[PDB]
Design an enzyme around this catalytic site. Structure first.
Site, PDB file in Angstrom:
ATOM      1  N   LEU A  12      13.927  31.141   9.089  1.00 50.80           N
ATOM      2  CA  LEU A  12      15.129  30.464   9.548  1.00 50.80           C
ATOM      3  C   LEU A  12      14.785  29.145  10.242  1.00 50.80           C
ATOM      4  O   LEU A  12      15.415  28.115   9.987  1.00 50.80           O
ATOM      5  CB  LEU A  12      15.929  31.376  10.485  1.00 50.80           C
ATOM      6  CG  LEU A  12      16.627  32.589   9.859  1.00 50.80           C
ATOM      7  CD1 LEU A  12      17.243  33.482  10.932  1.00 50.80           C
ATOM      8  CD2 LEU A  12      17.686  32.147   8.847  1.00 50.80           C
ATOM      9  N   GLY A  13      13.782  29.180  11.116  1.00 53.36           N
ATOM     10  CA  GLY A  13      13.356  27.998  11.844  1.00 53.36           C
ATOM     11  C   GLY A  13      11.961  28.128  12.424  1.00 53.36           C
ATOM     12  O   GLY A  13      10.965  27.889  11.739  1.00 53.36           O
ATOM     13  N   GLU A  14       7.856  31.142  15.193  1.00 53.12           N
ATOM     14  CA  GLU A  14       8.905  30.899  14.208  1.00 53.12           C
ATOM     15  C   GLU A  14      10.025  31.945  14.270  1.00 53.12           C
ATOM     16  O   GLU A  14       9.895  32.987  14.918  1.00 53.12           O
ATOM     17  CB  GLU A  14       8.322  30.882  12.799  1.00 53.12           C
ATOM     18  CG  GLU A  14       8.002  32.262  12.274  1.00 53.12           C
ATOM     19  CD  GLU A  14       7.754  32.271  10.784  1.00 53.12           C
ATOM     20  OE1 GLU A  14       7.540  33.368  10.225  1.00 53.12           O
ATOM     21  OE2 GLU A  14       7.777  31.181  10.170  1.00 53.12           O
ATOM     22  N   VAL A  15      11.126  31.652  13.585  1.00 55.58           N
ATOM     23  CA  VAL A  15      12.274  32.542  13.557  1.00 55.58           C
ATOM     24  C   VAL A  15      12.528  33.023  12.141  1.00 55.58           C
ATOM     25  O   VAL A  15      12.711  32.218  11.228  1.00 55.58           O
ATOM     26  CB  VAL A  15      13.552  31.851  14.085  1.00 55.58           C
ATOM     27  CG1 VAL A  15      14.724  32.817  14.081  1.00 55.58           C
ATOM     28  CG2 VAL A  15      13.323  31.315  15.484  1.00 55.58           C
ATOM     29  N   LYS A  30      12.225  36.181  16.770  1.00 55.24           N
ATOM     30  CA  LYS A  30      11.371  35.129  17.282  1.00 55.24           C
ATOM     31  C   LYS A  30       9.963  35.682  17.389  1.00 55.24           C
ATOM     32  O   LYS A  30       9.736  36.704  18.031  1.00 55.24           O
ATOM     33  CB  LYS A  30      11.860  34.670  18.657  1.00 55.24           C
ATOM     34  CG  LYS A  30      10.972  33.634  19.317  1.00 55.24           C
ATOM     35  CD  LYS A  30      11.206  32.252  18.740  1.00 55.24           C
ATOM     36  CE  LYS A  30      12.439  31.607  19.344  1.00 55.24           C
ATOM     37  NZ  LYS A  30      12.261  31.343  20.798  1.00 55.24           N
ATOM     38  N   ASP A 111      18.194  21.228  26.518  1.00 54.11           N
ATOM     39  CA  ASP A 111      17.926  20.700  25.189  1.00 54.11           C
ATOM     40  C   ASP A 111      19.147  20.744  24.278  1.00 54.11           C
ATOM     41  O   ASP A 111      19.016  20.997  23.090  1.00 54.11           O
ATOM     42  CB  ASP A 111      16.746  21.430  24.547  1.00 54.11           C
ATOM     43  CG  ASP A 111      16.047  20.597  23.496  1.00 54.11           C
ATOM     44  OD1 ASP A 111      15.313  21.168  22.674  1.00 54.11           O
ATOM     45  OD2 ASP A 111      16.229  19.372  23.489  1.00 54.11           O
TER      46      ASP A 111
HETATM   47  C1  LIG Z   1      18.930  27.419  10.258  1.00 54.22           C
HETATM   48  C2  LIG Z   1      19.873  28.340   9.822  1.00 54.22           C
HETATM   49  C3  LIG Z   1      20.187  29.435  10.617  1.00 54.22           C
HETATM   50  C4  LIG Z   1      19.556  29.614  11.838  1.00 54.22           C
HETATM   51  C5  LIG Z   1      19.887  30.702  12.629  1.00 54.22           C
HETATM   52  C6  LIG Z   1      20.799  31.638  12.399  1.00 54.22           C
HETATM   53  N1  LIG Z   1      20.807  32.488  13.423  1.00 54.22           N
HETATM   54  C7  LIG Z   1      19.908  32.107  14.326  1.00 54.22           C
HETATM   55  C8  LIG Z   1      19.524  32.629  15.551  1.00 54.22           C
HETATM   56  N2  LIG Z   1      18.585  32.035  16.263  1.00 54.22           N
HETATM   57  C9  LIG Z   1      17.966  30.928  15.831  1.00 54.22           C
HETATM   58  C10 LIG Z   1      16.991  30.353  16.631  1.00 54.22           C
HETATM   59  C11 LIG Z   1      16.274  29.275  16.365  1.00 54.22           C
HETATM   60  N3  LIG Z   1      15.475  29.073  17.408  1.00 54.22           N
HETATM   61  N4  LIG Z   1      15.675  29.940  18.259  1.00 54.22           N
HETATM   62  C12 LIG Z   1      16.617  30.770  17.831  1.00 54.22           C
HETATM   63  C13 LIG Z   1      18.308  30.351  14.616  1.00 54.22           C
HETATM   64  N5  LIG Z   1      19.299  30.962  13.856  1.00 54.22           N
HETATM   65  C14 LIG Z   1      18.621  28.690  12.278  1.00 54.22           C
HETATM   66  C15 LIG Z   1      18.307  27.595  11.486  1.00 54.22           C
END
Ligand SMILES: c1ccc(-c2cnc3cnc(-c4cn[nH]c4)cn23)cc1
Length: 251
Positions: A12-13, A14-15, A30, A111
């Site tokens: 997703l993003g 690490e995530v 995370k 941020d």
């Molecule tokens: C792109 C699409 C969905 C996402 C996405 C969808 N749900 C979440 C939850 N946390 C995060 C997150 C990121 N950093 N810390 C927490 C990203 N998320 C993120 C990027």
């Protein structure tokens, strides 16, 4: 790869996105190998405009967070265009809600930016990632912030020019810049410093230049109140609520 019941489906993003094999529930994961503070801060949070914290487990450390199907607010902005005013207003209301909440429990995100404003299935906005967050009020005592962080375009001027500064106006500034990018689809300056040409023009009230010309006069009036260089003359959230554009019916 999977953690416990959860299977990491995609990055997703690490995530990663984790789906439970049994309950089929999807969460955000995370993976970390200041984290302790983030976990501590997450536990303290309970708002509908803030990403949910489910819990953590150490092995690499694992933070379990609400998954927002919608993704970033960043995606919803169109470059050079922004998004329809009614949409931006609703989004800006949910952001004020989330930020008011944090501020009232003595927490500053530090941020704020469209990359850290996530959208759920209903398109509800959630303040996301508390890795840079900190306490600016404890036991009814406010502590000024000396450390520099965030993202240059969304950062307040005092933070580049001051030994210490109040946490709250800095989050208000960042919210203005986010408002600007929702209504204009572009960022005003690389940084708020006087050296930057764009910031100086804004200070002189040269509204004719982009991205201000692309913005309607009601929201532009609000931004005139938010992007005030004097952190003490800057408008407060309680005042933003009474703003005419903020309360204007749209759509
Ligand atoms: C792109 C699409 C969905 C996402 C996405 C969808 N749900 C979440 C939850 N946390 C995060 C997150 C990121 N950093 N810390 C927490 C990203 N998320 C993120 C990027």
């Amino acid at each position: 790869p999977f953690v416990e019941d959860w299977d990491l489906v995609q990055t997703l993003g690490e995530v990663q996105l984790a789906v439970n094999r049994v309950t089929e529930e999807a969460v955000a994961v995370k993976i970390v190998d200041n984290i302790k503070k983030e976990i501590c801060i997450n536990k303290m949070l309970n708002h509908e405009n803030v990403v949910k914290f489910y819990g953590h487990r150490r092995e690499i450390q694992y933070l379990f967070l609400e998954y927002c199907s919608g993704g970033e607010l960043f995606d919803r902005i169109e470059p050079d265009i922004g998004m329809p005013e009614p949409d931006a207003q609703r989004f800006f209301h949910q952001l004020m809600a989330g930020v008011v909440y944090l501020h009232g429990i003595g927490i500053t995100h530090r941020d704020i930016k469209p990359e850290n404003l996530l959208l759920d299935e209903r398109d509800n906005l959630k303040i996301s990632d508390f890795g840079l967050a900190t306490v600016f009020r404890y036991n009814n005592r406010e502590r000024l912030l000396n450390k520099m962080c965030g993202t240059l375009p969304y950062v307040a001027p005092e933070l580049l020019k001051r030994r210490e500064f109040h946490a709250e106006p800095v989050d208000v500034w960042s919210c203005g810049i986010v408002l600007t990018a929702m209504l204009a689809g572009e960022l005003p300056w690389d940084q708020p410093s006087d050296s930057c040409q764009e910031y100086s023009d804004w200070k002189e009230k040269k509204t004719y230049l982009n991205p201000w010309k692309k913005i309607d006069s009601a929201p532009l009036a609000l931004l005139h109140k938010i992007l005030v260089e004097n952190p003490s003359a800057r408008i407060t959230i309680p005042d933003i609520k009474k703003d005419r554009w903020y309360n204007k019916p749209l759509k």
